[PDB]
Amino acid sequence: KSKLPKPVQDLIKMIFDVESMKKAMVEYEIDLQKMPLGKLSKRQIQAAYSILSEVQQAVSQGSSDSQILDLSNRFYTLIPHDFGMKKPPLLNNADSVQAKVEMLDNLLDIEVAYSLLRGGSDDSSKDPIDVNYEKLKTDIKVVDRDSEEAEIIRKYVKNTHATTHNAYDLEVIDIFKIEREGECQRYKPFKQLHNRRLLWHGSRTTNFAGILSQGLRIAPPEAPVTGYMFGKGIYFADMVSKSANYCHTSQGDPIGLILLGEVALGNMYELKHASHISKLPKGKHSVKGLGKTTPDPSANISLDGVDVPLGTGISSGVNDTSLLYNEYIVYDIAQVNLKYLLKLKFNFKT
Template sequence: MRLKFKGGAAVDPESGLESKATVMRDAKGTPMTAVLGMVDLVKGYNSYYRLQALKSDSGTSFWVFRAWGRIGTTIGGTKLEKFTTESSARQNFEDLYLEKTGNHWRNRDNFVKVPHRFYEMQLDYEEIQKKSQAIIHAQSKLHPLLQSLLQFICDLESMKDAMIEFQIDVKKMPLGKLSKKQIQDALEVLSTLAKRVEKATRSKAALDPTVVLGESTRFYTLIPHDFGMKKPPLLDNPKIIKSKVQMLEDLREIELAYNILKQDLEQDVNPLDQHYRQLRTHLELLDTNSDEFARIQQYVKLTHGETHSSYKLEVVSVFDVEREDERARFEGYTTTRHNRQLLWHGSRRTNWVGILSQGLRIAPPEAPVTGYMFGKGIYFADMVSKSANYCFTSRNQPEGLLLLCEVILGDMHECTSANASPLPPGTHSRKGVGSTQPDPSTYYTSPDGVVYPIGKPQASGQKGTSLLYNEYIVYDVAQVLQKYLVRVKFLYN
């Protein structure tokens, strides 16, 4: 659905009035447009309702437009109603909003969800793509491989594809992306459900079906999904809750990237050059003939787990990373400085604008601990394929990005199974000890004392561990320094 913006708000294309009307504004200057959603898990439906008050460009005609239906189906309809006065159109819009949501339009900033009524979706209707295409004539001053990297991470279509992969409806629940508040509210819902599931598991009691149904419904209302004619699954077990936590983390990164990319482009500046400045990170292409490039290639080649046999990795390019202010924060971490290692971190293509501009971050307070095996922290690996799996590539989209970070591990709390409790006193990080590790006899130590755990996989000798490979977790962002961004191609068998 392509949107036409007039006066800062998009006229719904299905109204047929895109070329001759604008969205009315209320007394506060807010566009009188709303996208509503409602999920009923019992009846198995997932509905949307769009509502707009419109005024002709000449100011002589007034309408209220409505569109409704079931997400992921062709079920639905539209209605365009004409009014003789602006005030009567406004009143009709406000009456419909009250009827559908149980809330007065004038009080929408303090919206209260009413059972069996629609809930307002907070959507952003901006179109970045038009802006990016507006100044394509300006020549970029960046290295071609850096331009290619920026095109890769700033691609809006990949963000849309990720949302479709998450089963989020991007067609009829339309018109942009979800807001930060919706993501936070959805995390709180998952946190509530996770606590209920954990309590029921501990006490061996049954879950309250009414609570599970109510909270699941609220989640799907906050984050509209496309299940077609199928009932949305109840969020009643740790596995599905964990998957939705991961989805929301990725959505959070997409929301952050979108807000960076939607900023107005400067005249006579190539969009890629501006996006590069917005990252506030210096990226310098590493010479393929350098010792460091060869060392990173060796790290990729040797630390591929044998259980990750569906693909091999090929290094495309490596960039030296210098994030604004990150080094000062890293050097200011004085609790301990020993046991520094260069470790892998992988993430989806859509997450890298956020990672490069904001750094690696720890999950917010509203996120449930259930979604994280070793609690809320930043996770690393010494086996490249362990991290590469988090790139979520495919045969159709075979390229991904991996980060190599210098991590201050200090004294590690070693675990052989899930442990989300606080670190014991005197420890600075947690290590999930796997049954396989890189051969320690071939590790490389840099002149400044950083250990690169480069080696062929071998048995670690750890008995009774539930992990195949090592995981390293720190709980303070100051213990992490981004060093290299490695672009890789997944060569699927």
Template sequence: MIKTYLTNTHGKTHSGYTIDILQMFKVSRHGETERFQKFASAGNRMLLWHGSRLSNWAGIFSQGLRIAPPEAPVTGYMFGKGVYFADMFSKSANYCYASQTSRSGVLLLCEVALGDMNELLNAKYDADNLPKGKLSTKGVGQMAPAESKVTEDGVVVPLGKPKEEPSKRGSLLYNEYIVYNVEQIRMRYVLHVSFNFKGGR
């Protein structure tokens, strides 16, 4: 299932590389499952991608995914300071910042309790001030996986090939999902991958 999810959601606009999966692990961080339970009943739980630089992973594995501190400039966050996820593998893979000389990358697949989402077509830097009743933000892209699979425990895995959403004409090409409370996140899988770049980079 995970290999299908990865292969199908490699966007055509990210065609400058292919991916080899080197290692894949199922993970469970201490305490994460327990704190996640309060949001598990909120509904709309999805398995989503998160990529980051190699230098960040020691902190992520020891302390979990974190939200940027108050002093971090808000301009780097299209939808406010939160933890960002994608349903397109290659969108998250680009945040690994791999290169010809450093081809390794690490990505997470996380179960994210999104609940009722505040859907936005364009950037909103204060999106972390959610409307009442909303648990997350969805930056709606013009392309999205066409099909999903639901696991036995009710998690939606959007593993279909991307399809254009003609009614969605915002600034994003692909969907982004943002939560502002780390208790809505549960790490499920870690992937160690190798980037095979086409041509020189």
């Protein structure tokens, strides 16, 4: 039977949970009778991205109904929904396109996960636990409850947890010291670049299967530039309360995952407002969206050269920014080196 530690085995059970996948699709009113998990395809999703893209472009021009109407149906025909009765939500605005653009991202990770889960080892020589662990291609170790790292991280989860978005409370149940296969050599070169932070990264649980497998990727061109405030790229944060809002957990699903990947930002291109780009100025290596709140810089610590902004949340120099939380963006998957993976539990007060 399995040799891996219980805590790790449990992790392998939620990231490969089919119910979680179906439940994820049901939230999108996706009639599972027309689009089963085994019906999902990457070629189908891209075709969808293109449509959404054509939609956004249309809205920015003013197609004036019709073209948008048919362009809208062209989507729900490719992505089977079940609105019962009303009028299939017309994608005639940025907000509608962003929501849809967000659905494809998750559905894509689910497609990837559903694939791995069903590799080529349906035998019984090895239990499902130890088998699926392989498909991840990421060595996973459990971090003791009472250790330096644990304390640092857990303390990094407490401080950066303000009272504003305190509609819940975080509790570090498990802490893992992950490290995907290859992110070591691929990150070695960029490792020689000053300003290396240990930022947060949250995402739907049904996506970590693809995250550890594929690794934080950058949205493809077929994908709508809408939604992203700084263009296609990898986004992080220093306020654990900023990434948490991306785990999409709830009173019913309190358990969510979050990452702590080391990122060599180098010379940042500080911005206060949204600005779709993806062509940083000659000299910069990353973008930083100035926010109203920021971890107490005086209480910041740094280890192995990596900076850990585990300082209590305070007011930043400028408040004349649409962002209330910082936001670091890198446009090269090779600049990120996932380090930890927390199995946090959300406790809502209501």
